[PDB]
Amino acid sequence: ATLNQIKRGSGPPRRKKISTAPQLDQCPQRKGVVLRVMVLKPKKPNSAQRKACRVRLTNGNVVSAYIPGEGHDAQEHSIVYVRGGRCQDLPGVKYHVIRGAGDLSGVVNRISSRSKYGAKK
Amino acid sequence: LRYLKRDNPEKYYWTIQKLGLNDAAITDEFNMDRRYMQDYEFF
Amino acid sequence: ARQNFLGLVVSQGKMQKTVKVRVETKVFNKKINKELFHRRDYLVHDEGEISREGDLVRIEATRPLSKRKFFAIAEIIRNKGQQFALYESEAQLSVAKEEAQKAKEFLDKRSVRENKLLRDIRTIQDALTPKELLEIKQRETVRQLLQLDISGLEVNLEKQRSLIDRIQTRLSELLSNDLKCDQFLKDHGNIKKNLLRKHVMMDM
Amino acid sequence: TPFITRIMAELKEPLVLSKGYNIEEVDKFLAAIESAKRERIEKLEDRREAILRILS
Amino acid sequence: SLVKLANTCAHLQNCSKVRVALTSIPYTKLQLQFAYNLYQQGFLSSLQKGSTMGPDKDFVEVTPDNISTRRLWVGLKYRDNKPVLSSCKLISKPNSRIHLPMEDMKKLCSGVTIRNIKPLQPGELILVRAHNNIMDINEAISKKLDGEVLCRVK
Amino acid sequence: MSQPLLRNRSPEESELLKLKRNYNRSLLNFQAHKKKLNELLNLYHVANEFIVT
RNA sequence: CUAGAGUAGCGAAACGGAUUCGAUACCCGUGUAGUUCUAGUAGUAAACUAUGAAUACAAUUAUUUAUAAUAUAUAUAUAAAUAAUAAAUGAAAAUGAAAGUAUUCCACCUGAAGAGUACGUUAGCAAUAAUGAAACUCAAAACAAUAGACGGUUACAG
RNA sequence: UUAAGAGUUAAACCUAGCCAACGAUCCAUAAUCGAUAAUGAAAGUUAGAACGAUCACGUUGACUCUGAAAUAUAGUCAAUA
Ligand SMILES: [Mg+2]
Ligand SMILES: [Mg+2]
Ligand SMILES: [Mg+2]
Ligand SMILES: [Mg+2]
Ligand SMILES: [Mg+2]
Ligand SMILES: [Mg+2]
Ligand SMILES: [Mg+2]
Ligand SMILES: [Mg+2]
Ligand SMILES: [Mg+2]
Ligand SMILES: [Mg+2]
Ligand SMILES: [Mg+2]
Ligand SMILES: [Mg+2]
Ligand SMILES: [Mg+2]
Ligand SMILES: [Mg+2]
Ligand SMILES: [Mg+2]
Ligand SMILES: [Mg+2]
Ligand SMILES: [Mg+2]
Ligand SMILES: [Mg+2]
Ligand SMILES: [Mg+2]
Ligand SMILES: [Mg+2]
Ligand SMILES: [Mg+2]
Ligand SMILES: [Mg+2]
């Protein structure tokens, strides 16, 4: 609070924006291999059977990635691409798989938001 | 005595000589701590 | 010209021909918006080894003289370090002289008590001699022998009080009737007030 | 150190009186009291000794 | 002494809050110059020399005999249920002394924040010390004189 | 504003001031000594009744 | 806690008696350590005014408290403390000569949890004390006040 | 020895110093900067790709010749392939 204390290092804490996807190592996405496909239960009050998968990335980190879209064709040893973005109601799942990239096909018969689901016109 | 040294050095040196102290005894930090009481055998 | 700095000798006599000089410079700290003093200690060459701790000296840039010495004392601005050593040396003898003197005085006073009243007063008053008069001599008169110190103090005190009161009364009187003060100013030779007080104070 | 020792020794001398008294002055004052009383021996010695003991 | 000037600034604010018509400040050259600048600028109604007990009716000459009991007595102004001297603050603090050149002083008087100092306000007086003379900032600009920016009063 | 803030004490004023201060100190010391001798005398009166032998 | 003394009362632990569905508790009885003293170690408490120290200043009242007068009376002046306040401040509760107006220096804080934890280091006979993380998870978490509800909560009436 | 100062490198003799809680030593990480780019009201913060400036290196290490200047993308020896 005093001037000599501010000189010695006192000041406002930095508004430091922590990385929410540390396992990508500051990459837009990483290629990975799915170790298994899981069906998890969201936190309450939400109720569903959420589609996820464990994926080992090329940098060696193993993460849990949500599989978006109505239906997916992910299976053990599938090559996937993983970007940031958590699944809010699944604790521990902090990544998303990219539909339409790698061995994961785009959503079938998607009409709206096709680019978010790897679907052609 | 440190003030006296800063003010009148001649009288300072005469005074500390007559009182039984040296310049180190005056200028050095002196917490009358347990180590002093052991080194100089106060008790 | 060469780089010059002003500093305080903070460490001398520990290295041959080298001293440590503490210098300070004005810097601006923008993080705190303040003009600060930046401090540094230099190893400085001292040919002649004239400097002492606490001296204010001007150091000047030179060729490299060692791994870390690049400056030399160019001038002793203030020499408190040398004065401290002088007084250190002088006090040694100065103190011891009167230390012996007053020890002598203490021993003499002790002896005076050793070889050392009412009986003498009785003899002086009654015998007023049986071989005792001269024996007392070896040590109008009953009073002067019984002469306390307080009486001299009272006489001196009355003298002091009289002097102060008389000076003030005379000063006020002269300042009141201002013709005779002029008379006295030309007799003895707003400033006139101070000069008048000077003349009145020497007057008594 | 000579100063501290001499001061303490002078404190420890005999016939040293407290409360700012001096033995020479005290003796002269007592003699002056007696002479003044005359002007207007063992008992006086006892009075003196009591005073010196109280003021020792 | 900036500490004593800060004490005077705070004391003036305190006396304006309670609306005392007359108060005292320490008797020093800096205090007297500051009070005189306030008096000439219209912030004070009167400035007198005096003692710890009150302003002097007649001239009393200051000497070492009475220096410790001298004070400067200032009369505060109020109008339309508002104090004329509401705020009085130091710019150059004891632990951060701010010395500006004439150009930065002009910038400050022209609305620029210099060294975190808010610029001069429409009815505000900023005082500057130069060669142990307190003076108005605009006057220092006119005389082309760098100096220590001392205090604001509004 | 033109008047000097402080006027130095002249040597004569200093001499008178030192005279008065020395007198004050001397008077206090003398009064202490006088009351001291008085208390001694008042003990010297009642010293008859003090056992020493 | 380490030694050496002391140990009447109290009393961790332990052993029993009750109570209880159960008693591992509250209650009862014996009662070791401790509480005591001497020489040490240790350096922690809600070690609190949950409020660091110093300086200058700001409107009142009432009490004491302590001096200094003046002749019990001046409902006596000058100080400190205490109590209630003005202003001011404040999220308010409230603070109130500081939680006000200012200045100087130091300590400390930066969501909850993980955690005063782990690891390391230092000290200590030990117990421990100090120093003191990060990953993981979440959109919480807290303070003052408001109105209720509730209380094996009070008092008054009928 | 060098054109040239200096425990710079080599030799000898001495003195006992030097740095450090305003952070030494050690460890890790990183080419650096601008009248360059981004951002912001600004202080600043970020980058150091592009334009320019400086440094270092040309598979790794040491040494040597020549040269005004090189441990040179040279030469010698060794390592790796
Ligand atoms: Mg959509
Ligand atoms: Mg050399
Ligand atoms: Mg024991
Ligand atoms: Mg017991
Ligand atoms: Mg019991
Ligand atoms: Mg229970
Ligand atoms: Mg029991
Ligand atoms: Mg202890
Ligand atoms: Mg603890
Ligand atoms: Mg604590
Ligand atoms: Mg607060
Ligand atoms: Mg611990
Ligand atoms: Mg050499
Ligand atoms: Mg060598
Ligand atoms: Mg370091
Ligand atoms: Mg690198
Ligand atoms: Mg960088
Ligand atoms: Mg570039
Ligand atoms: Mg490039
Ligand atoms: Mg190369
Ligand atoms: Mg290559
Ligand atoms: Mg190479």
Swiss-Prot record, chain A:
Disulfide bonds: none annotated. Signal peptide: none annotated. GO terms for cellular component: mitochondrial inner membrane; mitochondrial small ribosomal subunit; mitochondrion; ribosome. GO terms for biological process: mitochondrial translation; translation. One of its GO terms (molecular function) is structural constituent of ribosome. Keywords: Mitochondrion, Ribonucleoprotein, Ribosomal protein, Transit peptide. Its main location: mitochondrion. It is found in: Mitochondrion. It comes from the Eukaryota. Belongs to the universal ribosomal protein uS12 family. Component of the mitochondrial small ribosomal subunit (mt-SSU). Mature yeast 74S mitochondrial ribosomes consist of a small (37S) and a large (54S) subunit. The 37S small subunit contains a 15S ribosomal RNA (15S mt-rRNA) and 34 different proteins. The 54S large subunit contains a 21S rRNA (21S mt-rRNA) and 46 different proteins. uS12m forms part of the decoding center of the mt-SSU. Component of the mitochondrial ribosome (mitoribosome), a dedicated translation machinery responsible for the synthesis of mitochondrial genome-encoded proteins, including at least some of the essential transmembrane subunits of the mitochondrial respiratory chain. The mitoribosomes are attached to the mitochondrial inner membrane and translation products are cotranslationally integrated into the membrane. uS12m is required for respiratory growth. Present with 238 molecules/cell in log phase SD medium. The chain holds residues 29 to 149 of 153 of the full protein.
Curated annotation (Swiss-Prot), chain C:
Keywords: Mitochondrion, Ribonucleoprotein, Ribosomal protein, RNA-binding, rRNA-binding, Sporulation. Pfam families: Ribosomal_S17 (PF00366). GO terms for biological process: mitochondrial translation; sporulation resulting in formation of a cellular spore. It is found in: Mitochondrion. Its main location: mitochondrion. GO terms for molecular function: rRNA binding; structural constituent of ribosome. SUPFAM superfamilies: Nucleic acid-binding proteins. It comes from the Eukaryota. Component of the mitochondrial ribosome (mitoribosome), a dedicated translation machinery responsible for the synthesis of mitochondrial genome-encoded proteins, including at least some of the essential transmembrane subunits of the mitochondrial respiratory chain. The mitoribosomes are attached to the mitochondrial inner membrane and translation products are cotranslationally integrated into the membrane. uS17m may have a meiosis-specific role as it accumulates during the middle stage of sporulation. Present with 2810 molecules/cell in log phase SD medium. Belongs to the universal ribosomal protein uS17 family. This is Small ribosomal subunit protein uS17m. The gene is MRPS17.
UniProtKB/Swiss-Prot annotation, chain D:
The precursor is processed in two steps involving mitochondrial intermediate peptidase (MIP) and mitochondrial processing peptidase (MPP). Belongs to the universal ribosomal protein uS15 family. Component of the mitochondrial small ribosomal subunit (mt-SSU). Mature yeast 74S mitochondrial ribosomes consist of a small (37S) and a large (54S) subunit. The 37S small subunit contains a 15S ribosomal RNA (15S mt-rRNA) and 34 different proteins. The 54S large subunit contains a 21S rRNA (21S mt-rRNA) and 46 different proteins. The chain holds residues 73 to 143 of 286 of the full protein. Signal peptide: none annotated. Present with 6960 molecules/cell in log phase SD medium. Component of the mitochondrial ribosome (mitoribosome), a dedicated translation machinery responsible for the synthesis of mitochondrial genome-encoded proteins, including at least some of the essential transmembrane subunits of the mitochondrial respiratory chain. The mitoribosomes are attached to the mitochondrial inner membrane and translation products are cotranslationally integrated into the membrane. This is Small ribosomal subunit protein uS15m. It is found in: Mitochondrion. It comes from the Eukaryota.
Curated annotation (Swiss-Prot), chain F:
It is found in: Mitochondrion. It comes from the Eukaryota. Component of the mitochondrial small ribosomal subunit (mt-SSU). Mature yeast 74S mitochondrial ribosomes consist of a small (37S) and a large (54S) subunit. The 37S small subunit contains a 15S ribosomal RNA (15S mt-rRNA) and 34 different proteins. The 54S large subunit contains a 21S rRNA (21S mt-rRNA) and 46 different proteins. Component of the mitochondrial ribosome (mitoribosome), a dedicated translation machinery responsible for the synthesis of mitochondrial genome-encoded proteins, including at least some of the essential transmembrane subunits of the mitochondrial respiratory chain. The mitoribosomes are attached to the mitochondrial inner membrane and translation products are cotranslationally integrated into the membrane. Present with 2010 molecules/cell in log phase SD medium. Belongs to the mitochondrion-specific ribosomal protein mS26 family. This is Small ribosomal subunit protein mS26. It comes from Saccharomyces cerevisiae (strain ATCC 204508 / S288c) (Baker's yeast). The lineage of its organism: Eukaryota, Fungi, Dikarya, Ascomycota, Saccharomycotina.
